[PDB]
Amino acid sequence: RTIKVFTTVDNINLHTQVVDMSMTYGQQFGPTYLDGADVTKIKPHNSHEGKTFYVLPNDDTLRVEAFEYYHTTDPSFLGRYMSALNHTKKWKYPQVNGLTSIKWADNNCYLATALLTLQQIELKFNPPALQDAYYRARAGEAANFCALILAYCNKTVGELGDVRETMSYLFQHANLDSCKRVLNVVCKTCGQQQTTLKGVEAVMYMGTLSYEQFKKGVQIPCTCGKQATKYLVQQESPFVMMSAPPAQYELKHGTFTCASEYTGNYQCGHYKHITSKETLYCIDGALLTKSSEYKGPITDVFYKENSYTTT
Ligand SMILES: *[C@H](CC(=O)OC)C(=O)NNC(=O)CCc1ccccc1C(=O)N[C@H](C)c1cccc2ccccc12
Ligand SMILES: [Zn+2]
Ligand SMILES: [Zn+2]
Ligand SMILES: [Zn+2]
């Protein structure tokens, strides 16, 4: 005796199966997951009739379908993803100032910061798995998106995480082709060395929190040997993310889009989100806090942009 279930790798192309109800899912298909739960080892239950199961791909049809949804051939991915989903599906995603945050759980403050940031910057993702899961997170259903961010970043539920680190990972999976940053460097010896940057390196700088400061200039070690200073000529990008190791910093309403607060030490600290709406909101999972100024330990500041030229 049998029942009728659907299997997929992407959740777009379903593939109806007839399952022997006395063998396990593992023997009939392969490693198999329902709603993120591993079900490799259980026998088809009667309520499982008419439900979608994620499976690894055997067929090259499914191997191509998985690539075109996830842009990864990596065999471990779909499992690492389903593993996360099983947890993130249990997380609570409260609206907090019409933003989808995550109630703190299974160590997720950095994810909640990254997620809140990702709803305030104009980001087009390349893996359809991600672009779809995002759109859904925007609308409050954010389990899937968090699971993928974890999988795509090689992190797991419980692991601690840098926001700078988690963003660059995602920027790398985002169309930032038309992003261009022209630098200029001047040592009084080397001469006048003008670099161009495209893509992810165009929209991140580790060094100062201050977009203003970068435009004026910041001192560097330089090509020839020693003493030189580098300043932003041009920046065509829809945003830039200025990072630097946690200082104390005054955030003023209207000078910046949003920021990452980091209390504590390297790799054993707690993150909060500062966003500049009518006032400065500070978001800590499900806890909103507003304030006209904000001095605290800032490490990442996102600025909105499209085209800037120097003088
Ligand atoms: C939240 C923890 C929680 O949920 O508790 C309620 C969480 O996951 N926090 N993340 C971390 O603690 C992990 C921090 C981390 C991980 C890897 C690499 C760097 C970092 C990190 O500490 N980043 C911070 C911002 C940092 C970056 C660069 C320099 C520097 C210098 C001094 C302190 C901190 C940093
Ligand atoms: Zn890709
Ligand atoms: Zn030099
Ligand atoms: Zn600790």
Numbering used by the authors: 3 to 313
What text comes from the article?
PLpro is a 35-kDa domain of Nsp3, a 215-kDa multidomain protein that is key to maturation of the viral replicase-transcriptase complex (RTC). In addition to RTC maturation, PLpro enables evasion of the host immune response by cleaving ubiquitin and the ubiquitin-like interferon-stimulated gene 15 (ISG15) protein from host protein conjugates. PLpro consists of thumb, fingers, and palm subdomains common to other ubiquitin-specific proteases, and an N-terminal ubiquitin-like domain involved in substrate recognition. The active site, which is located at the interface of the thumb and palm subdomains, consists of a catalytic triad comprising Cys111, His272, and Asp28612–14.
We reasoned that replacing the methyl substituent of GRL0617 with a hydrolytically stable linker connected to an electrophile capable of reacting with Cys111 would yield a potent covalent inhibitor of PLpro. Following the promising results from in vitro assays and mass spectrometry experiments, we determined a crystal structure of wild-type PLpro in complex with 7 at 3.10 Å resolution. The electron density maps show clear densities for PLpro, Zn cations, and 7, confirming the design concept of this compound and revealing key interactions with PLpro. A covalent bond is present between Sγ of Cys111 and the β carbon of the ester of 7. The carbonyl oxygen of the ester accepts hydrogen bonds from the indole side chain of Trp106, like that of the tetrapeptide-based covalent inhibitor VIR25111, and also from the side chain of Asn109. Indeed, the crystal structure revealed that the proximal and distal carbonyl oxygens of the linker interact with the backbone N-H groups of Gly163 and Gly271, and the proximal and distal N-H groups of this moiety participate in hydrogen bonds with the carbonyl backbones of Gly271 and Gly163. As intended, the carbonyl oxygen and N-H group of the amide adjacent to the naphthyl group of 7 are hydrogen bonded with the N-H backbone of Gln269 and the carboxylate side chain of Asp164. In contrast, in the co-crystal structure of PLpro with 7 the side chain of Leu162 is rotated outward away from the BL2 loop to allow the electrophile to access Cys111. However, when 7 is bound the BL2 loop shifts inward and covers the inhibitor to stabilize the bound form. Severe steric clashes are present between the naphthyl ring of 7 and Phe828 and Lys838 of USP4, both of which are conserved in 80% of human USPs.
